Write a protein that binds this ligand. Structure first.
Ligand SMILES: NC(=O)c1ccc[n+]([C@@H]2O[C@H](COP(=O)([O-])OP(=O)(O)OC[C@H]3O[C@@H](n4cnc5c(N)ncnc54)[C@H](OP(=O)(O)O)[C@@H]3O)[C@@H](O)[C@H]2O)c1
Ligand SMILES: NC(=O)c1ccc[n+]([C@@H]2O[C@H](COP(=O)([O-])OP(=O)(O)OC[C@H]3O[C@@H](n4cnc5c(N)ncnc54)[C@H](OP(=O)(O)O)[C@@H]3O)[C@@H](O)[C@H]2O)c1
Lengths: 331, 331
């Protein structure tokens, strides 16, 4: 038997409760590949799935965890064999299927990628869906012409996961990064990741009447969404793009079309969950080359399975800095 | 001397009036190239500049007309000589500079393009800024992977200028075009342009509470904006893009970020006004080959300078079908 975080739901009271429980291999959903999980992480979406559900969890009891990395234990698919090091992010794992908050997980072979060279399984989860998506966002901006030397690139919710990794990647690629944070005490941390400007949240997180403000930003990786995204759109330089990643400041987008029509601004939707295998490989290879591992290390907050209920609540309140690494085998 | 539409403003009352007046060459702003205008057209923006101003006209009296096509009369720039056929769209002509509603116009040589071999000056204005921007929008969709055979392409405000040209181009390129109109009597016209489905405006011009509806549209050329655009975003297929062109339905964008985040949808801002010379040439050559001239002909509504005050008022009310061609030399 082995340990896993299991969320139960009482339909009478609606109450969800997460707790570490002991499971057997026959408790997992049937799957092509059984992975001995070494690490997982805590993404914003994991906080939803650990706690209230956010409408993302269709079946209880539920083992959350949209990410894991580990070593293949058994496989009926010729792409993977015992001993292979593999990485899972997304594919609705941790939402519609039991996930990485477990010492063992069963998955479709289509859902895995090989552990990218340059990362161990710990670092792969230090990156996580959050860091993987920051890379996708940077790639989207590059695809639309972003190059260094043309003004600051805005990173919103910068003290969090997506924001920390995007800051580190963009700084390493030679960009001037303006980091937006509601936690001013993280400035030194953000500067150590490579940020060149620190922007207070309350300077940019409300809409204004004017549909256009001055052109400031050469591009943006947005983990916040909401009214902040609406405001940022009116501050983009001509032809610049926003990579839309997050909704931590709200799902509503109270925008105007004026920045798009008058300045050729783009709003580029970034979905990590259903990325094709080939682009997953591409983004992970970019991560191994362009995310300095010493910068990644500075983001890591260690945790165990027993820490997940509290960390899930913390991340939804915006109180997790950097990137949690869950050692599902600790002790 | 020569005829032109002149708009005057009473700066006390703020009211404007437009009428045909007789001007001399020295009434025009100084310019590098004097063009004997043959045709202009009526764009939505021209309706603003003919009438209330829309905040776009810095100086009165004003000769409006953001577009013209005609024959060079004199030039101090080696790029153009007397007899050359030339096309002007945008570059703030008709807004910050006297424009095409005149038998003669002075312009910077930077602002012109040579008339494509496949268009005459009448056809170039039947296309106009509206049709030129429709082509830019199609090009943006193709640059983001739009190809035929992957679902209908939505064209909003289809009975108008942008919409009519987008419908005809997309249909000729092999797409199934869904044409959104608030004028149901234009259905047969839209079908004659190549539309395969007719969508009533009131079916799609309100927001809904659900942030995602079913995936339907392979792409969209949007002349309407407003709540219609917000609704359309939740109906785009995974990875599909909206080319944002217009705001005829309102400048506000009461959207959510959910289609961007969960479906990788893109909102791509199209600006015709300041397109670089090289891209203008490519768009015009695309127009010459991808817009059937008999389809364009079915869009044309002939006009003279004296018709412009009424047509400017009409287009702002959504009451112009197709593409006005103004013969500034009519007898
Ligand atoms: N589209 C995808 O595939 C994809 C992949 C990963 C994440 N996402 C989304 O991206 C967002 C970030 O994920 P994450 O794991 O990095 O979570 P996170 O660590 O909590 O990052 C979010 C940051 O946003 C800021 N923030 C929180 N609440 C805010 C508010 N009300 N107003 C303004 N800023 C606020 C906080 O940073 P500061 O303290 O620095 O202000 C917070 O740390 C989430 O919404 C998540 O769902 C989507
Ligand atoms: N970004 C650029 O560079 C650029 C270039 C050209 C045009 N634009 C803009 O694109 C839009 C269209 O220009 P246009 O010259 O083609 O004008 P247009 O001929 O009047 O076309 C607009 C069409 O939109 C529909 N419409 C009007 N009011 C509406 C409303 N309240 N709700 C829903 N639909 C409405 C009408 O079509 P139906 O009768 O079929 O419903 C109308 O004919 C304008 O907003 C214009 O400013 C921008």
């Amino acid at each position: 038997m082995f340990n896993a975080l299991v969320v139960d739901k009482d339909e009478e009271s609606g109450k969800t409760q997460a707790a570490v429980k002991q499971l057997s291999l026959t408790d997992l959903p049937v799957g092509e590949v059984t992975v001995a999980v070494e690490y997982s992480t805590v993404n914003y979406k994991d906080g939803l799935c650990i706690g209230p559900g956010g409408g993302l969890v269709r079946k209880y009891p539920h083992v959350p965890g949209i990410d894991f990395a580990g070593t293949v234990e058994n496989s009926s698919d010729e792409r993977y064999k015992p001993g292979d090091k593999v990485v899972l992010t997304g594919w609705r794992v941790g939402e519609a299927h039991w996930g990485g908050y477990s010492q063992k997980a069963n998955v479709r072979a289509d859902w895995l990628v090989p552990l990218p060279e340059g990362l161990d399984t710990r670092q792969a989860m230090a990156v996580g869906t959050a860091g993987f998506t920051a890379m996708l966002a940077v790639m989207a901006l590059e695809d639309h012409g972003l190059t260094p030397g043309h003004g600051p690139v805005l990173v919103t919710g910068a003290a969090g996961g997506v924001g920390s990794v995007a800051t580190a990647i963009l700084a390493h690629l030679g960009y001037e990064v303006a980091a937006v944070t509601g936690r001013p005490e993280t400035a030194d941390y953000l500067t150590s990741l490579g940020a060149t400007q620190i922007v207070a949240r309350d300077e940019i997180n409300e809409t204004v009447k004017r549909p256009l403000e001055s052109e400031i930003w050469a591009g943006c990786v947005d983990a916040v969404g909401g009214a902040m995204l609406a405001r940022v759109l009116g501050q983009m330089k001509y032809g610049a793009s926003v990579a839309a990643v997050g909704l931590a400041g709200g799902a509503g987008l109270p925008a105007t079309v004026i920045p798009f029509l008058l300045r050729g601004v783009n709003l580029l939707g970034i979905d990590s969950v259903m990325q094709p295998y080939a682009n997953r490989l591409r983004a992970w290879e970019r991560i191994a080359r362009d995310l300095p591992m010493d910068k990644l290390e500075a983001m890591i907050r260690p945790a165990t399975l027993s820490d997940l209920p509290g960390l899930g609540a913390d991340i939804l309140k915006g109180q997790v800095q950097g990137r949690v690494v869950v050692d599902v085998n600790a002790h």
